[PDB]
């Protein structure tokens, strides 16, 4: 067979130890999920420095804690705008998830609080910027470099899926690089805790699984499809399905055809054909062997999964770091005032925050 006795025993033991870790991780998650933390700081504890990112979600600002001098990334949401965009449940759920999870590649929520006007999530500052920026600048990542990042996503999805969390928002724009070169996942607005199927049309066109496009009920296998898209884009420099307009992207996604650059290794192409598998009964991550079909694939043969989890692998790329508070890996944004009305707004809606 493929493994002799020693290798088979070692793999079996490793897989059993993952089960044991995940059982404990779930116990710990459920305690925090059922009794979430609230109101662990306030606004005047922080100096506001610079806007790191903006969007319909609100903004994220680099802030400095006045006593410790520690920097953090503060997400600011306007309660009235959240209500208007129909994002109450997503916003409450994101904060509830972030305060309950614990994994080395998931950003930590260090404080949260609210005031009359806004909600505030104070997260660790991840100073390396978006994977997106590095990927577009470098062009494409070597297979070893792509693999190092992919392994972290595999472990992160193994963890989240064990908690019945579907992620649904994977793309290089949503992955940050930390000072040691490891990934941080930050956005949980589209994540959902569901054991079976769900139906919402959500995500980013290039990363949508066929079953989402086709208005089917779908499950956690959409995250494994999205991993295939991410690995492809990291290694090629462009995603597997693109076009001028989303409708044309969706036609290609559902077609069952993908083409690969000539520099992709055979191992990489085989992994991607099994992740970018339109037939759910055949997609890796969705079979009886679960995540092990991915972790044991030849493309990952050199990956030491425990060493990745322990952060003991030397990263292939370290972002430039000019010190605490350095924002050079993020774009520049127009700075806008932070208004706190004298009158409480949308109080009942956000009682749980």
């Amino acid at each position: 067979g493929h493994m002799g006795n020693a290798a088979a025993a070692k793999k079996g033991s490793e897989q059993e130890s993952v089960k044991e870790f995940l059982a404990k991780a779930k116990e710990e998650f459920l305690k925090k999920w059922e009794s979430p933390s609230q109101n662990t700081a306030q606004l005047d504890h922080f100096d506001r420095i610079k806007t790191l990112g903006t969007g319909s979600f609100g903004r994220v600002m680099l802030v400095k804690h006045k006593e410790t001098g520690n920097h953090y990334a503060m997400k600011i949401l306007d309660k009235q705008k959240v209500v208007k965009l129909k994002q109450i449940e997503h916003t409450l759920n994101e904060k509830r998830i972030l305060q309950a999870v614990n994994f080395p590649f998931l950003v930590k929520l260090e404080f949260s609080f609210k005031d009359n006007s806004n909600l505030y999530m104070v997260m660790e500052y991840v100073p390396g910027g978006e994977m997106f920026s590095h990927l577009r600048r470098i062009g494409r990542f070597s297979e070893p470099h792509a693999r190092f990042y992919a392994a972290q996503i595999v472990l992160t999805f193994e963890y989240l899926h064990s908690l019945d969390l579907i992620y649904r928002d994977l793309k290089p724009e949503n992955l940050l690089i930390d000072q040691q070169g490891y990934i941080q996942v930050t956005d949980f607005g589209f994540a959902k805790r569901v054991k079976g199927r769900t139906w919402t049309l959500c995500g980013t066109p290039e990363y949508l699984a066929p079953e989402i496009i086709l208005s089917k009920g779908y499950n956690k296998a959409v995250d494994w499809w999205a991993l295939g898209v991410l690995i492809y884009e990291m290694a090629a420099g462009y995603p597997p399905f693109f076009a001028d307009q989303p409708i044309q992207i969706y036609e290609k996604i559902v077609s069952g055809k993908v083409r690969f650059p000539s520099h992709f290794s055979s191992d990489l192409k085989d992994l991607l054909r099994n992740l970018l598998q339109v037939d759910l009964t055949k997609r890796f991550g969705n079979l009886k062997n679960g995540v092990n079909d991915i972790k044991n694939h030849k493309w990952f043969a050199t990956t030491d999964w425990i060493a990745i989890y322990q952060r003991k692998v030397e990263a292939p790329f370290i972002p430039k770091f000019k010190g605490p508070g350095d924002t050079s890996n993020f774009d520049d944004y127009e700075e806008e005032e932070i208004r706190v009305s004298i009158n409480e707004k949308c109080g009942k809606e956000f009682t749980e925050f």
Binding site: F132, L201, C202, F242, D244
Partner: peptide
């Protein structure tokens, strides 16, 4: 080429999710 097609797509920048 595929790369040129990607540039021509106009989708080389940060991509919004559907809800946006």
């Amino acid at each position: 080429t595929t790369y040129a097609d990607f540039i021509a797509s106009g989708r080389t920048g940060r991509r919004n999710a559907i809800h946006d």
